[PDB]
Amino acid sequence: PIRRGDVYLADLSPVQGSEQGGVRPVVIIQNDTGNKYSPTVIVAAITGRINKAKIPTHVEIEKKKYKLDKDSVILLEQIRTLDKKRLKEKLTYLSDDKMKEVDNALMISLGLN
Amino acid sequence: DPIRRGDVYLADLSPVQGSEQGGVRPVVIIQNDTGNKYSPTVIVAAITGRINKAKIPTHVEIEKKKYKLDKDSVILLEQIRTLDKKRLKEKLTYLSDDKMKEVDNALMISLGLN
């Protein structure tokens, strides 16, 4: 039942250097065929806002959700493939409008167009 | 940093869990070049030797044999991650513009873009 745009709690550790660690919310960015059948998902890390700045690859989460600060930011430059066993609990999902901004930052992040 | 989108680097992807791609293996840099110049991190796709050649929309075959790269190699656009640059070991090679177009296409399939 995992779908693109869902938000899950995931354990991202261990990490190294500037990679995003901890157990934190992540947004599922993989296509839904993959989410249905594959052992793995691709996700983008979400973090609380530290020093609000205008960064092309970041997307602000606006509405406060379950286990999600209102100040939260999706980091489209912190991306990874996780075994699904890493997903802990479904927190929420993002609106179609928000997922458009996510797609746009993802395309910036990955040098697509 | 001289690191550029389309470069292939040897990188240590371990530790990993479950079906995540582990080991020290070649990876292709897929992040935009502003990030590759200035950022502490890069985004990459894992490359592996071909096990049971199959027609998988998110895989891209490397055709020409390169340094420390088998000719049978496949780029896995469903195994993607952000690595601290300290993880990159040595530059193996770079991919042609034509090959990077196939990579972009599989990447868009993989991530549900269009």
Numbering used by the authors:
A (entry chain B): 1 to 113
B (entry chain A): 0 to 113
The publication says:
TA modules are small operons encoding two proteins: a ‘toxin’ that interferes with basic cellular metabolism, usually translation or transcription, and an ‘antitoxin’ that neutralizes the toxin and protects the cell from its potentially destructive activity (for reviews see 1–4). The toxin MazF is activated under a number of stressful conditions via proteolytic degradation of its neutralizing antitoxin MazE by the ClpPA or Lon proteases, (18,30,35) and was proposed to be under control of quorum sensing. In this paper, we present a method to obtain large quantities of active SaMazF and provide the structure of this protein as determined by nuclear magnetic resonance (NMR) and X-ray crystallography. The SaMazF dimer is formed by pairing strand S6 from two monomers to form a dimer-wide 10-strand anti-parallel β-sheet.
Three different crystal forms of SaMazF are available, which lead to the structures of 14 crystallographically independent SaMazF monomers forming 7 independent dimers. In particular, among the two loops that show higher RMSD values in the X-ray ensemble, loop S3-S4 (Gly48-Lys54) is involved in lattice contacts in all structures. It is unlikely, however, that crystal lattice interactions have a major influence on the conformation of this rather extended loop given that all conformations observed seem to belong to a single family, with only two individual conformations (form I chain D and form II chain A) deviating somewhat from the canonical conformation. Loop S4-S5 (Ile61-Lys70) is involved in lattice contacts in most but not all SaMazF monomers. Four classes of conformations are observed. The most common conformation is observed in ten chains, two cases of which do not involve lattice contacts. In the remaining four chains, this conformation is prohibited as it would lead to steric clashes with a neighboring monomer. Of these remaining chains, form II chains A and B adopt the same conformation while form III chains D and E each adopt a unique conformation. Loops S4-S5 of the latter four chains are all involved in lattice contacts. Thus, it seems like loop S4-S5 will adopt a default conformation when the crystal environment allows for it, but will adapt its conformation otherwise.
